[PDB]
Amino acid sequence: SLTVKAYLLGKEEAAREIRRFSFCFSPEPEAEAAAGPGPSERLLSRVAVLFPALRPGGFQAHYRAERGDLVAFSSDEELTMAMSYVKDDIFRIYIKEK
């Protein structure tokens, strides 16, 4: 399992709301239903129901890189890399509504 921590940012980039959810170390939930994506579409799904303060699918999750800068990710291929940075079982990300 892997707990993913999300950080809500308003106008002053200030933590608006904080929530976490238990994730599976597996690559994807389904094998047949999955039509390409998996982790991204899954995470972005929770963040929506967890952060109703903003649109359901009108937001972009930005993750810190080796440099620290923010990189709005939206693809499974990007997730597998994001986890490569964190050595622990905690995946932190910056949530921002479009």
Place this chain on the structure above:
Amino acid sequence: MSLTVEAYLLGKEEAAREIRRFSFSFSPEPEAEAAAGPGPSERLLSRVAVLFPALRPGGFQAHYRDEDGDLVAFSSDEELTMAMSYVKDDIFAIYIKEK
């Protein structure tokens, strides 16, 4: 078994406004038929309301400290079972904040 839950009221300067505690049951949920999903969360959030009338009845969010210490606004039973996993004693501390 029993478990006392301590709540901390926060105003504008995040200063302790009011302090109150209530005896809780170690059981998973109070009812089995009436319960329509939730249990501990809906139960705790119920007391905090009657205990902290200074704010809205259901217009508040309880934040609990994590392994890191940061505040995590919880609102689901699944989140409660985890919060208790942190505290080893029979005292559950939480930060109450009115929306």
